[model samples]
Target: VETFAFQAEIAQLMSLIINTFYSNKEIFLRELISNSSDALDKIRYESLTDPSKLDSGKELHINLIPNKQDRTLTIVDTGIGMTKADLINNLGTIAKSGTKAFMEALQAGADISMIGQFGVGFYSAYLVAEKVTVITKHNDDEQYAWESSAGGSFTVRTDTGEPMGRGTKVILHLKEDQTEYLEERRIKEIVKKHSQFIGYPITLFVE
Candidate 1:
């Protein structure tokens, strides 16, 4: 894996996620599920217009897998994934151009309002997980892993990919103070309050 330092105020921004942006820390899960839904929608729309883009019989869904012994929670989606460049652009930097483009799309009368292209809400993972790993496979490229510790930098490299199909998986190494996030009942409560209406199925599996 190649390491790359975050170019902005990385430390301060991480502080903001836990301190400022949210009153309820559990929204981190809600935001993650919401983002996954957006990704699924993007792929489904593309596949509708272009038949070749669709994955054969692979259901579009999201899974929340928790490992109690390891104290980790992984959110996996059968949706559009990211390339190395996307890993760098999406995770490494804050959204300046993305917000600009969002407004431009709105002005052009395009149906806007994806949580992405606004700012880096994904950083909320750091609020509960000290380390986060994103393994993704885009239709246009091979799979890669984006790993970080909510620190100064992140690492990314080509994954041998246990044959990762077109989708993304995010593994969160839960923090000591936040281990309750691994509970299926807890997550279900949050999902019911925040993401129950999301069109796709959200299943919880424990190990």
Candidate 2:
């Protein structure tokens, strides 16, 4: 369970996203789904060059599981997962090239429709979740879990539970005020509005 502090830029970026996007909190769902789609695209592209990458035969798709009892929303995707270093570098730091431009756009009150362009779209999760946990397994790396509350630091640990096959699972511990995210109807509406034409199938588990 090794832990690491978020880079100063990430910490600042998180707060900015949460506070600035208050009214548009529902966009969190869109951003997350988009990220999952991007991951799926990567795995598909890689499998073209290396057939073994798809040996698991897991059909590429995304699942949304909302547990009202637990106040949690889980987004699962059978896509290219992440390594420990990928988790740390991608989630902990503003390592992408257009991040500075993103920050400038945010401060200048520019249209945030470009949220996913700089790779910081993941931080939009903080808009509705008080904490986030990502359990992922890459083709070439062991399964690992990355967790953080956007409070300052995050932890990464080897996953010892049931194998997740080849994919990524993101569990969002929704904030008390953001419980609407746990509603099947609300989620479906959001998906319809923002991701109706996304290539991968997005399934919402309903009891």
Candidate 3:
């Protein structure tokens, strides 16, 4: 909802991606939850070598929140949160997204491709959100939030509310153009069809 224009490349990337993947928006949740599991996995591994690397308690879960009022759906998690530079690099580039770089960083080290290699996972939030709000808190730094409309540019700042502990909550301000999916039956059908095998419990909160 902020007024910053996206970078030329970001603008172009957004349009291309949105139009190209428009029909399969349901996959967005699948990818997002998968990313959450991957984040939890990373920290869990780090903690094994050095217990101090662990942030808070070890339990993790994926959540879905649907806001028919604002026409938004939020996929939240108690996992690693991105930072200032992360916001810039994540929302700004094609080849250097957090998921991509993180995948390469880990893949090269362990010769295993995290589910994150599915580049452009975060951007999938835009399928349902006209504006995306990422509220995150990490044990290492103060809590922060980032906002963008997938227009190519975004903003990051210290969050002004109680933190969600050390995790990332992606709030999707869904576009009016895409609202039929708000129906409970529709959402569950899609979830079962595409993401029932997410390897973690998928909690759905509807109001």
Report the number of the highest-TM-score candidate.
2
Query: Against the true structure, what is every candidate's RMSD?
Result: 5.6, 1.4, 6.3
Q: Which stretches of candidate 1 lie over 4 Å from their true place?
A: 18-23, 96-118
Worst 10 residues of 1 by lDDT: 110-119
**Which window of 10 residues has the lowest lDDT sum in candidate 3?**
109-118
Best by lDDT: 2
List, residue by residue over 96-140, the lDDT tens digit for candidate 3: 544445434543662222323546667666666678888877767
TM-score of each: 0.84, 0.95, 0.78
How good is model 2 by TM-score?
A: 0.95
Pairs clashing within candidate 3: 6-152, 6-153
Off by over 4 Å in 3: 1-8, 19-21, 52-55, 95-118
lDDT of 3: 0.68
- Residues 69-114, candidate 2: write the lDDT tens digits: 8889999998999988898898888876366788888778765667
lDDT of 2 at 103: 84
